[PDB]
Ligand binder design. Structure first.
Ligand SMILES: [Zn+2]
Ligand SMILES: [Zn+2]
Ligand SMILES: [Zn+2]
Lengths: 7, 69
């Protein structure tokens, strides 16, 4: 799953 | 919309937490930190949103540590 932390 | 759905601070130049299911569930790091410390941790919206299935998503321990720093 991809991190929920984004930029 | 690129701002926190709790405190409504813009998120255009920084990092944030993005709910994997609900796109409008964006949260700044301070708001995510407040939900983690209070929960123990599902979606800071409180709607216990699920994964991309039906099981609700939760922060991984490494994500929690990143937010607390
Ligand atoms: Zn916020
Ligand atoms: Zn807003
Ligand atoms: Zn959510």
């Amino acid at each position: 799953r991809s991190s929920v932390i984004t930029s | 919309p690129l701002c926190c759905t709790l405190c409504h601070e813009r998120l255009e130049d920084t990092h944030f937490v993005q709910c994997p299911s609900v796109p409008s569930h964006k949260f700044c790091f301070p708001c995510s930190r407040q939900s983690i410390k209070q929960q123990g941790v599902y979606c800071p919206s409180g709607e216990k949103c699920p994964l991309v299935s039906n099981v609700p998503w939760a922060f991984m321990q490494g994500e929690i540590a990143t937010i607390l720093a």
